């Protein structure tokens, strides 16, 4: 089953389950960060989702088809992280992104701190389009966190 | 085994909490997908 929405990625280990990440189902494709699944297959009810496209450097992977998320941050509007933390209800957090300055151009970045298993939570523009996924970032001097707004090439 | 389970609809929420600053950081991205502060 591939109904559009946001999903937890779980691993059944030892006894109960552990949430290792989060992803987005859109246009029949599942989208998440590579470090969540390590690029391995996923179960969805009784159905198996096979990796289709992925890139360790971008830290992304799509399942069942090519990356479908094509909307981009507009570089000046506030965005929302739809955070789906382990053991907690999905919730929206609005923020004005900062910027990762790289030798190859600027990336929007959000200074919001959640557990590792929140990785893959989508970041949204005001139209509700997913403009990237949360969770590949850096830890700055005081220990707080800044995540790139990571988006694939559609 | 890894499996997925639905967690919600994807929507903008109008009455949303607003928080976090807007840092500007010089970073490098290496071939392993790690960002590092420069
Ligand atoms: C809330 C709770 C406090 C939780 N918080 C976090 O874990 C992160 N918040 C933070 N304030 N530390 C947000 C993690 C968001 C999900 N994203 C990842 O989990 C990727 C997974 C890797 C993707 C790699 N391509 N991790 C990174 O982006 C970065 C940056 C990697 C830098 C590479 N030079 N690593 C870390 O934060 C590891 C770390 C360091 C010190 C201390 C800790 C955890 C202990 N804190 C925690 O347990």
Task: Say how many C-beta atoms besides its own lie within 10 A of residue B7's C-beta.
Answer: 19
Phi/psi of residue A10, each to 5°? -120, 155
- Burial of residue A14 (number of CB atoms within 10 Å: 0-12, 13-18, 19+): exposed
Give the CA distances from residue A129 to residues A52, A59, A125, in Å, rounded to whole numbers and listed in that order: 22, 20, 6
- A129 and A149 co-located in one domain: yes
A43·B3 Cβ contact <8 A: yes
CA distance A68 to A135: 19
- A128 and A114 co-located in one domain: yes
Stretch (H or E) spanning B18? strand B17-18
What range does the domain containing A122 cover? 70-154
| Closest chain A CA to residue B9 | A5
- A147 and A91 co-located in one domain: yes
Active site residues of A: 35, 59, 119
Largest Cα span, chain B: 40
- A25 and A86 co-located in one domain: no
A95·B37 Cβ contact <8 A: no
- Angle (nearest 5°) at CA A129 between A7 and A116: 40
Q: Tell me the pairing of strands A79-83 and A60-63.
A: unpaired
Ligand 1 atom at shortest distance from the alpha carbon of A137: 28
Q: Sheet harboring A122-124: ordered strands across?
A: A130-133, A122-124, A79-83, A91-95, B17-18
Residue B23 token pair: 């840092």
Residue bearing the CA closest to ligand 1, atom 5: A115
Interface of A with B in 48-77 (CB under 8 A): 49, 55-59
**Structure-token match 């246009």, residue found:** A27
Ligand 1 atom at shortest distance from the alpha carbon of B36: 34
CA distance A62 to A54: 6
SS3 B19: coil
| Closest chain A CA to residue B27 | A102
- A61 and A106 co-located in one domain: no
- A10 and A52 co-located in one domain: yes
Q: Which of A84, A110, A132, A139 to mutate to test the pocket of ligand 1 (most atoms within 8 A of CB)?
A: A139
Asked which of A69, A98, A129 is the last residue of a domain, the reply is: A69
Within its chain, how far is the Cα of A115 from the centroid?
13
- A56 and A124 co-located in one domain: no
CA distance A127 to A29: 20
Domain ranges of chain B: 1-38
- Identify the contact set of chain B against chain A, taking CB-CB distances under 8 A: 1-13, 16-33, 35-37
- Burial of residue B1 (number of CB atoms within 10 Å: 0-12, 13-18, 19+): exposed
The technique by which this structure was obtained is: X-ray
- A40 and A76 co-located in one domain: no
- A62 and A76 co-located in one domain: no
Distance, in angstroms, between B16 CA and closest chain A CA? 6
HEC string for chain A: CCCCEEEEEEEECCCCEEEEEEEEEECCEEEEEHHHHCCCCEEECCEEECEEEEECCCCEEEECCCCCCCCCCCCCCCEEEEECCCCCCCEEEEECCEEEEECCEEEEEECCCCCHHHCCCEEECCCCCEEEECCCEEECCCCCEEEECECCCC
- A65 and A75 co-located in one domain: no
Within its chain, how far is the Cα of A100 from the centroid?
17
Best CA proximity match to B20, nearest among A64, A93, A120, A11: A93
């Amino acid at each position: 089953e591939t109904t559009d929405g946001v999903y937890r990625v779980m691993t059944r280990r030892l006894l109960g389950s552990t949430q290792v990440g989060v992803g987005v189902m859109q246009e029949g494709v599942f989208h998440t960060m590579w470090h969540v699944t390590k690029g391995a297959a996923l179960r969805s009810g009784e159905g198996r989702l096979d990796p289709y496209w992925g890139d360790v450097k971008q830290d992304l992977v799509s399942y069942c088809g090519p990356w479908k998320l094509d909307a981009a941050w507009d570089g000046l509007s506030e965005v929302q992280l739809l955070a789906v933390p382990p053991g907690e209800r999905a919730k929206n957090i609005q923020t004005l992104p900062g910027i990762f300055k790289t030798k190859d151009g600027d990336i929007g970045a959000v200074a919001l701190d959640y557990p590792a298993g929140t990785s893959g939570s989508p970041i949204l523009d005001k139209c509700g389009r997913v403009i990237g996924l949360y969770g590949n970032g850096v830890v700055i001097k005081n220990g707080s966190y800044v995540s790139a707004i990571t988006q694939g090439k559609r | 085994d890894m499996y997925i389970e639905r967690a919600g609809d994807i929507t903008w929420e109008k009455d949303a909490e607003v928080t976090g600053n807007s840092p500007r950081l010089d970073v490098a991205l290496d071939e392993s997908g790690d960002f590092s502060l420069v």
